[PDB]
C-alpha cells in the first residue's frame, strides 16, 4: 500500500451491486468524480446488467465510446463513471430516459422518465460557506459548486436544477412537514414524512419519520434527503412508492 | 535519514519498544538549517506532495512592523541579542522565531520625518534609546527555515520592559 489502489476485488465491491461471486476475480472500480465509491453505480454495471445492452466489458466500451450516453445534460465517455443518486441517465439513440433512484430493498433502480421531466434534477445541499471575496456558494450532494445562491439556501435543504442551463428552479426547506427519501442505512429507499427532529449537542441529529401507511422509524440526519414539501413529491417514486412490505407480505407475494 | 516516528521511543511504563517494520518516508525529517546572519543565501527544498519550502541559510534584511504606527518597513538586521531557548544562538546570530534582534531604525526614522515632520533620534522610554543609539529591538515572528524570510515586529511597552531587563 505505497499509493492509491487501482483494483477492486469482486468480494469487496459494494453489496447492492449484486455481482455474482463466481463471475470473476475483479469488480469495476468506479473512477473518482461526483459520487462516492459505495454511493454510486458505475456506467458499465448499468448497461451490462440492468439493461443487457452489452454482454461484457468489451461491448460496453463500444457503446460508450460511440458517444451515445448522456449523464445529466453532458455526454460521458468514461466506462466507469460513477452514477449515484437521481442524476438522470439519457440514451437518445433508444429514446429513453432513466433516473437512478433507490428502492426499499436497499438497491439502485432505474425509474423511467418522460423527456420533459428528464430535463430537471433535485440536488441536496451539503454545505454553504463564504468564498473568497464574500462570494457565497453551495455544495450539493452531487458535488456541484454553485455560485451566488439565494440567501435562504441553508445547509440541509434540497434544490431543483435545470440541467440544460444549470440554474436553480425550486428549493425545498428541510422542515418537519416535508417528504424525505432515505439514502443511508436500514432506511435505504424508504419514503415518509418528517415528524420529529431531536438534536444531541455532541454527536448527531436523529430524525423521526412517519411512513405513509402509519409506520414510524428513525434515521440519522445524514441519510435524510428531502423530496418535496407537504407530502407532495417533486419526483416520481419507484413502483413500491417508498413503502416497505414487512417481510411476510414480500415472501407471500414472491410465492404467488 | 532522521526519523520522527514514535516506534524508537519507550512506552509510558518505561518498557522498551520492539521493532516490526523499517524506516519509512512518512516519518522522514530533514537536517535543520541554522539561519545565520550574512549575505542572502536561500535554497528550494522539495517537500512531500511536490510543495516547495524556502530554506533560508543566511539572511541580512527583513520586514518589520510597528504596531502603534501601523506600518511595515524593510530593514537591515544588525545583531541578535537574546534567544530564549539557547544562548549559543546569540553568539552565532542564528535567526529563528522569538529571537530578539537589533535592527537599525533608519527607514522608520525617515518615515516619521515625512509623516509628522519630526525626528525620533507617548512612546516607551527604551524605544527612544534604541532610536538614538541606532539599534532598536525587534522580535522575529516568521519561520526563516521554512518560509525563507525574516518577518517581525518592533517590541513595545510591556514586551520591551521584560526583554530589556533580560539584558
Amino acid at each position: 500500500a505505497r499509493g492509491p489502489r487501482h483494483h477492486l476485488k469482486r468480494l469487496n465491491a459494494p453489496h447492492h451491486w449484486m455481482l455474482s461471486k463466481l463471475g470473476g476475480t475483479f469488480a469495476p472500480k468506479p473512477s473518482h468524480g461526483p459520487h462516492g465509491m459505495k454511493e454510486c453505480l458505475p456506467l458499465i454495471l448499468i448497461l451490462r446488467n440492468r439493461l443487457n445492452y452489452a454482454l461484457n466489458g468489451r461491448e460496453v466500451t463500444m457503446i460508450v465510446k460511440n458517444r451515445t450516453i448522456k449523464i445529466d445534460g453532458k455526454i460521458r465517455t468514461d466506462t466507469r463513471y460513477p452514477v449515484g443518486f437521481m442524476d438522470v441517465l439519457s440514451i437518445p439513440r433508444t429514446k429513453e430516459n432513466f433516473r437512478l433512484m433507490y428502492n426499499t430493498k436497499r438497491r439502485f433502480c432505474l425509474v423511467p422518465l418522460t423527456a420533459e421531466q428528464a430535463k430537471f434534477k433535485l440536488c441536496k445541499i451539503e454545505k454553504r460557506v463564504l468564498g473568497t471575496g464574500a462570494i457565497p456558494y453551495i455544495v450539493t450532494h452531487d458535488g456541484r459548486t454553485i455560485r451566488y445562491p439565494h440567501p435562504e439556501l441553508q445547509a440541509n435543504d434540497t434544490i431543483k436544477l435545470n440541467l440544460e442551463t444549470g440554474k436553480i428552479v425550486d428549493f425545498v426547506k428541510f422542515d418537519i412537514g416535508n417528504t424525505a427519501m432515505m439514502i443511508g442505512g436500514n432506511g435505504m429507499g424508504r419514503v415518509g414524512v418528517i415528524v420529529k427532529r431531536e438534536v444531541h449537542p455532541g454527536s448527531f441529529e436523529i430524525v423521526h419519520i412517519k411512513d405513509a401507511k402509519g409506520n414510524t422509524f428513525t434515521t440519522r440526519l445524514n441519510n435524510v434527503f428531502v423530496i418535496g414539501k407537504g407530502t407532495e413529491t417533486l419526483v416520481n417514486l419507484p413502483l413500491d412508492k417508498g413503502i416497505k412490505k414487512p417481510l411476510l407480505q414480500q415472501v407471500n407475494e414472491t410465492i404467488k | 535519514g532522521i526519523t520522527r516516528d514514535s516506534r524508537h521511543k519507550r512506552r509510558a511504563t518505561g518498557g522498551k519498544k520492539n521493532s516490526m517494520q523499517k524506516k519509512k518516508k512518512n516519518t522522514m525529517g530533514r537536517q535543520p538549517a541554522n539561519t545565520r546572519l550574512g549575505a542572502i543565501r536561500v535554497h528550494d527544498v522539495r517537500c512531500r506532495y511536490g510543495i516547495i519550502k524556502r530554506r533560508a541559510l543566511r539572511l541580512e534584511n527583513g520586514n518589520f512592523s510597528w504596531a502603534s504606527q501601523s506600518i511595515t518597513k524593510g530593514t537591515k538586521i544588525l545583531n541578535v541579542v537574546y534567544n530564549a531557548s539557547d544562548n549559543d544562538f546569540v553568539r552565532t546570530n542564528t535567526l529563528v522565531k522569538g529571537a530578539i534582534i537589533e535592527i537599525d531604525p533608519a527607514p522608520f526614522r525617515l518615515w516619521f520625518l515625512k509623516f509628522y515632520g519630526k525626528d525620533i533620534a507617548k512612546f516607551d522610554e527604551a524605544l527612544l534609546e534604541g532610536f538614538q543609539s541606532g539599534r532598536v529591538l525587534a522580535c522575529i515572528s516568521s519561520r526563516p527555515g521554512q518560509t525563507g524570510s525574516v518577518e517581525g515586529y518592533i517590541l513595545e511597552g510591556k514586551e520591551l520592559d521584560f526583554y530589556s531587563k533580560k539584558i
Binding site: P201, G202 | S68, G98, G157, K158, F162
Partner: protein, 154 residues
Amino acid sequence: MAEQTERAYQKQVFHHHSRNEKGEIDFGNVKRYHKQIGMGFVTPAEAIKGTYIDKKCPFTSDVSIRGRTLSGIVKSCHMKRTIIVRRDYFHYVSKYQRYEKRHKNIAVHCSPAFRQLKEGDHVVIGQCRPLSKTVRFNVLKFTSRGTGDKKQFA
C-alpha cells in the same frame, strides 16, 4: 507579573489591544481572551478574572474539545499543569458470566483555572489534540471529595 517566570514572554494565542475611552485602539493593554467550550460546559470564573497564561487551556486558547468525553478520579497531582486520572470499570468475561474489576490511567492536562483541584477529586475530562507524548485530554470540570490528610493540590 507573576505569570512571567520563564525565559520567554508569555502571551495568549489571541492577544488584542482594547479601545480606550476615546474610542481608539489602546496599545497600552491587552484584552484577556476567553472563549466558551461546547456541550454544556460553563467557563470557570478563573478563566475570566484570572491572569494566568496557558496555551493548552480549553477556555483561554485555540485548543478544541472533540467528541470523546470521559470521567474519573484524580490520582496524582505532582507534575506541572498535568494530572493522572484513573478510571475504574468492569470487564465482562463471557465464559464465567462474571465481571472483573479493571483500571486504566489517563494523563490529562489541567489548566490553572481549576485551582482547588487535589488528589481524589472527581474530574470530567474531554478529548483534544495531542498536547504531549501521552497527554491527549483536558479537564473540563471537577468536584471536590473527602480528604485523606494529604491535600496535594495541582
